[PDB]
Amino acid sequence: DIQVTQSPSPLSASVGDRVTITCRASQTIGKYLNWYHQIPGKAPKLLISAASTLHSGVPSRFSGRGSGTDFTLTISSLQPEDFGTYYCQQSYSSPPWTFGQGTKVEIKRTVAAPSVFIFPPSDEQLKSGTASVVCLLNNFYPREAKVQWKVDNALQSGNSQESVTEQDSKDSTYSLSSTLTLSKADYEKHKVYACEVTHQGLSSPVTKSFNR
Amino acid sequence: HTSSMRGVYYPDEIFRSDTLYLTQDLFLPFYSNVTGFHTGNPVIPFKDGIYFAATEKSNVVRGWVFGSTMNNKSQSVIIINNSTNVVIRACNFELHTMIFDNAFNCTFEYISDAKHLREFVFKNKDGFLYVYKGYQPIDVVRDLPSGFNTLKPIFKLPLGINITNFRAILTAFAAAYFVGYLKPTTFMLKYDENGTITDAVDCSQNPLAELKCSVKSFEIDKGIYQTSNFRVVPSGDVVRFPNITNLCPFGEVFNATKFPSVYAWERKKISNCVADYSVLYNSTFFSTFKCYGVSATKLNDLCFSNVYADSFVVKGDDVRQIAPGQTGVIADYNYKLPDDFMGCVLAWNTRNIDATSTGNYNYKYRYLRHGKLRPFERDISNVPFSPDGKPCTPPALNCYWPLNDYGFYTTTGIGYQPYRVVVLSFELLNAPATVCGPKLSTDLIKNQCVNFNFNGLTGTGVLTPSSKRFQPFQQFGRDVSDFTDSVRDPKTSEILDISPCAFGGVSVITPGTNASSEVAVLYQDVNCTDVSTAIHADQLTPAWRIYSTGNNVFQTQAGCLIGAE
Amino acid sequence: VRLVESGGGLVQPGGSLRLSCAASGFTFRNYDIHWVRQTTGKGLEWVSAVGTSGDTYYLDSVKGRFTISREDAKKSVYLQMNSLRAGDTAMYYCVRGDASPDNIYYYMDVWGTGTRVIVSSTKGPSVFPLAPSSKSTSGGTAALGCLVKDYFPEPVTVSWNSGALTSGVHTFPAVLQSSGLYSLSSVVTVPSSSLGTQTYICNVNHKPSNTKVDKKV
């Protein structure tokens, strides 16, 4: 079909207002393409029309251009109430109304150092036969760090789930919660549980561990 | 003798929380000329929408009989209040005592048994009588005081009668009428706690009220603000797509007992029709119904210049290259399609027809040809091929027919079944409308700010005849700003269309709501010379009722600030 | 111009569950009405729509399973989901299509609020209280723990004594495990003095079995 690919990297919006939101497609379309906006938490809404018919509801600062197959979304001075993900949809294939993927727009501030703290499993969970290894990662601006799990010099992966919160409005930092669920036998077999944290804003990879 | 913000009623009965709703059906603009009669015996005026108000005690004016011309000419509804016995009769005629006059034919007997100011607003729309009730204690005897007087409906009996008069006033009294006409405008209401209004803003009295209605807020800061000035003078709506013509042959397309091959697809031209588009929506068995230029639903709303039909048979899942851009063996050798196709495609299964259990070798396709096909190209050649000349008599060395027959059978897969693809090529070239939707048209109203809905040109403005440089084959025309300038009528009387509309949307400069109560306007792009002429003649779009002009100054990008010298 | 959703979703994969989309004072007798499927981290995959005529569009995947119907006077649009599978758990929206000149764009003019139709089983949340108070790290900076597990719906929130100091912390969104249950990990920052001071009560509540449980960690 009409495969449309957006920008595969979120654009961290600084104090500037120079965005390069692209909505390139496979074939060529004159103006059979629109742009939307969805703040995470609510329903989406129309942001930019087909580059020449921007109507009310959206401020006139948000501009739009497009022709052929390379589309550009030029935006004026950014406002704090105009953040979120902007989607684009093709209007050529009429029955298959397929939208795009999504381009997230976040806030840019000073780099913060994540306070790495790994916590042992709870006491009451041991009575049920399960074990949860939770490693906390809070107070960090760069939302690009990944958590590595190593137990007794053995690479542990595939059984861990991470949860990242939205960017706060007080310190503009992120918080990550990586939980590694292990069985009771695998927990009692090992003694050392290390939480390897690799972050860009850190000069050295900080690794915390504890003994049973 | 002036309606000081009187006549505000609820537009519906749905409860709403604290919000700012924009009402369109509300009537009785504020500060309107009310024809109060401070009194062939009565002074019965035309109705045109009225506003009933009684400022006399002892219940002097307690009866009003709606209907039409008297002297037994049309049905009339009698609304009389006598000893708390409100009997609403709508059958008595007139060849206090106007009830027992004639008894030719009576029906629909409705009986409802059970200083002072009682306000009533009567509305008749599409044969529906809306009656509201409102009371407000007053003490002055000069004229109608100010207030809000939230109205509440009491009776909504349609009766299918267009009311035009009111009569049957009592006697032996003071006795006044206080009836005022209403005009269709827009209103902005406030929804406070407990479901009360207590505040309304009519967006038709002053430019300041229009500015307040623009930003949807009861407080205006300093600066310049304006939103299209599209809530000043509304009117009706004109339509197009005139009376139907001979039926479109789209039905006979999906009925042929035999269908051509892929390389010999037949091109049938369709013109001078009114397509119903019912065989495309209904009978949902088209497995590959796709549209590329126009929306798959917005088909009965456009007038295409010329439509066609391309019927051919493809083998199962091979229907993936009848789309603009797709390449393959059935995209450059048998059937092509332009990059901007602007049309729909369909495909339905024919397994129970074009398939046998002993050999259905009757369909072929071209798979070897020098170069690629151009958009909408057809070739029915049959000759061995070789890219060095080579007439290539069949059995000489390696010559074979560049046409592979299909393998249609009964016990096969889904991807190897005959799918008949009918390709409808829509067009919007410069030519008279040959195919439209099954709609009806009305008369072309001149000199009225009615919204126009042409074949493919919508919008609003003052449709006025003019004279420009048009061509016989050209139907419509656009402006420099990609706006509809002129367009001929599809039915008859091919003439020019709406002239240039009002000179942009005038802005309202307000230095602050709490600062003062003054109001000033700022025209975006005008000449500050014909503005007064367009306003005083009620021909301009932002034409306010209570509006004047004090001084106009013309400079580079003047923007005549009317409201302060 | 606003559309309000109704209902939700609780049935298991293999059942029927319909939706509804109301309207407002706008003229809802000539515009279009389509659906939108947002899987909370995936693409908006829905193409079904009904027009003014008897036009009924569907998706190539869910074909012959779902049916659409609209009512002009009632200002409501329905969407029945027969033979519901487990890969449809998402938030369903209602949109409107309109073209300004004649046909060019649809604009997806007015959206709705959403309706979550989840297809799985439900259980009771189990909180893990009695976090390690002082066993390996007492001074410096630390954090508590009120991890919850085994709960299908997540109408939960963890307040910290309804607010008594100025520290600043927020909870984490839940994550669906492989078994089919959710889990939350609520943490709290430590003030200038927390050892032997004002404690914190994790107010985990809103259990489908109407069994509240709160305990200090």
Residue numbers in the entry:
A (entry chain L): 1 to 212
B (entry chain A): 33 to 71, 77 to 132, 149 to 167, 180 to 238, 249 to 640
C (entry chain H): 2 to 218
Reproduce, without paraphrasing, sentences from the article in which this PDB structure was first reported.
We also determined the structures of PW5-535 complexed with the stabilized prefusion ectodomain of Omicron XBB S (6 P) and SARS-CoV S (2 P). As a contrast, two states of SARS-CoV S–PW5-535 were observed: 3 up-RBDs with 3 PW5-535 Fabs (3.05 Å), and RBD monomer with PW5-535 Fabs (3.54 Å). Notably, the monomer state is only observed in SARS-CoV S–PW5-535 but not in XBB S–PW5-535, implying that SARS-CoV S(2 P) itself is not as stable as XBB S (6 P). PW5-535 induces SARS-CoV S disassembly, and buries a larger surface area of 1128 Å2 on SARS-CoV S monomer, involving 22 RBD residues, generating 24 pairs of hydrogen bonds and forming 2 patches of hydrophobic interactions. Compared with Omicron XBB, slight differences are observed in the interaction between PW5-535 and SARS-CoV S monomer. Firstly, K64, P102, N104 of heavy chain form extra hydrogen bonds with T359, G531, T533, L532, G368 and S370. Secondly, Y58 of heavy chain and P85, P96, and W97 of light chain do not form hydrophobic interaction but replaced by two hydrophobic patches between P102 of CDRH3 and L532, and between Y32, Y92 of CDRL and G409, F457, P440, Y408. Thirdly, S101, P102, D103 of CDRH3 formed 3 pairs of hydrogen bonds with G531, L532, T533 of SD1, further improving the affinity of the antibody. The conformational change after the unstable depolymerization of SARS-CoV S leads to exposure of more accessible epitopes.
